[PDB]
Design a protein around this ligand. Structure first.
Ligand SMILES: CC(C)Nc1ccc2cnn(-c3cncc(-n4ccc(CC(=O)O)c4)n3)c2c1
Length: 331
C-alpha cells in the first residue's frame, strides 16, 4: 500500500517546457569573478554549509555580503548558483552580485547585495499590524515569483528574510535548499528548518511541491501576529508534528494521512495522542490583540492546513482581504 501521488495545483509544468539548461544545473559551468575585489569586514553568522560576513568591494567602497561555503558537493554549489541567476531581478529576491574562489577556504564564496537588516527577534517586537501585512505581501511577491519560475525555496523562515525597515525593503535569502519542481518527483524531506517544516515533511511524504513554502509562511505569520517566535516549538522532528497536532487537532491530521495513504512512522503512535483543533482566538492576548484581526485569522487558517494541496498558493493569498490596504503600488 504505497502513497497516493500528488501534483502542485499551479506552475505544474513550467520547467517541463523550458530549455534543459534552465533547470539542469549539473551541466552549469560557473564563471568566476575576482576575489581580490572583496574584503571581509564582519561575521554575520555561520552554518553547517557556510559562514556569512559583511564586506566591502574594494573597487567602489560598496558594502556587500559574502557567503563562504563549506565543502558540500559541486552539484550542490551549481544548484544554488543557477537558481540565483535564474531568479535575479525578481521582486524581493536577494541579488547575487558575484561568485569567487575563496583562496583561504579553497571553496566558493557567493557575493550578494547588502541589506541594512534589523535582527528579526528585535524587529518583530516593534512591528505594527500594517507592517506585518506589508512585509507578508512582500514575501508573497517573492514566493509567487520563484514558484512561477518553477522553483521551491524550501527554507522559508524569519532568518532568511532580510528587512531594511526604514526603507520598507525586504529580500528573501539563502536559496541553498532551493530546488526545481518536476511533477511526480519524490524529493528529500530533509529540508526547511524544524519549526517551519510542513506536515508533509514530518510524515515523510516525498511528492510535495511549492505548497511547502506556504506552510512555512503560515508559521511566520502566526509567530508574527501572536508574538510567539517560533509559533510551533517542537523538541525534534517528531514532537514538532505533535505541537502542530495540539493546535490543528489530530482528526484532520489523520484524515490527511488516509487521503494520501501515508504510513506513519510507528514512533508517532505513542506521542500524537488525541487533540481537538483549537480556535485561533486561543492565542490572542493583551500583548498581540492589536495585531490580530478576523482577516488575519482567516488568512492564517487558509495557509496552515495539513493537506498541502488545499493550502492557498502565493498568488491566491495575495488576493486575501487581509491585504486590501497594503498601499497598493499604483504610483
Ligand atoms: C547568515 C545570515 C542568514 N544571517 C545574518 C545575520 C545578520 C545579518 C546582518 N545583515 N545581514 C545580511 C544583510 N544583507 C544581506 C545578507 N545576506 C545575503 C545573502 C545571505 C546568505 C544566503 O543567501 O544564504 C545573507 N545578510 C545578516 C545576515
Amino acid at each position: 500500500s504505497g502513497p497516493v501521488p500528488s501534483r502542485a495545483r499551479v506552475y505544474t509544468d513550467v520547467n517541463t517546457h523550458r530549455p534543459r539548461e534552465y533547470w539542469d544545473y549539473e551541466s552549469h559551468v560557473v564563471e568566476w569573478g575576482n576575489q581580490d575585489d572583496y574584503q571581509l569586514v564582519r561575521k554575520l553568522g555561520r552554518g553547517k554549509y557556510s559562514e556569512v560576513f559583511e564586506a566591502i568591494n574594494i573597487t567602489n567602497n560598496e558594502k556587500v555580503v559574502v557567503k563562504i561555503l563549506k565543502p558540500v558537493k559541486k552539484k550542490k554549489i551549481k544548484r544554488e548558483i543557477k537558481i540565483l541567476e535564474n531568479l535575479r531581478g525578481g521582486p524581493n529576491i536577494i541579488t547575487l552580485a558575484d561568485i569567487v574562489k575563496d583562496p583561504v577556504s579553497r571553496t566558493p564564496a557567493l557575493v550578494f547585495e547588502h541589506v541594512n537588516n534589523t535582527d528579526f527577534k528585535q524587529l518583530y517586537q516593534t512591528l505594527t499590524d500594517y507592517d506585518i501585512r506589508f512585509y507578508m505581501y512582500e514575501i508573497l511577491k517573492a514566493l509567487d515569483y520563484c514558484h512561477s519560475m518553477g522553483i521551491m525555496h524550501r527554507d522559508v523562515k524569519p532568518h532568511n528574510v532580510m528587512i531594511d525597515h526604514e526603507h520598507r525593503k525586504l529580500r528573501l535569502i539563502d536559496w541553498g535548499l532551493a530546488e526545481f519542481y518536476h511533477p511526480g518527483q519524490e524529493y528529500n524531506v530533509r529540508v526547511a528548518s524544524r519549526y517551519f517544516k510542513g506536515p508533509e515533511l514530518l510524515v515523510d511524504y516525498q511528492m510535495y511541491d511549492y505548497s511547502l513554502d506556504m506552510w512555512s509562511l503560515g508559521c511566520m505569520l502566526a509567530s508574527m501576529i501572536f508574538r510567539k517566535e517560533p509559533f510551533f516549538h517542537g523538541h525534534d522532528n517528531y514532537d514538532q508534528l505533535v505541537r502542530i497536532a495540539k493546535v490543528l487537532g489530530t482528526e484532520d491530521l489523520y484524515d490527511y494521512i488516509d487521503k494520501y495513504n501515508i504510513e506513519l512512522d510507528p514512533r508517532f503512535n505513542d506521542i500524537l495522542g488525541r487533540h481537538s483543533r483549537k480556535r485561533w482566538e486561543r492565542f490572542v492576548h493583551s500583548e498581540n490583540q492589536h495585531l490580530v484581526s478576523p482577516e488575519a485569522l482567516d488568512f492564517l487558517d487558509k495557509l496552515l492546513r495539513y493537506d498541502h494541496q488545499s493550502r492557498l498558493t502565493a498568488r491566491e493569498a495575495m488576493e486575501h482581504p487581509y491585504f486590501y490596504t497594503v498601499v497598493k503600488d499604483q504610483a
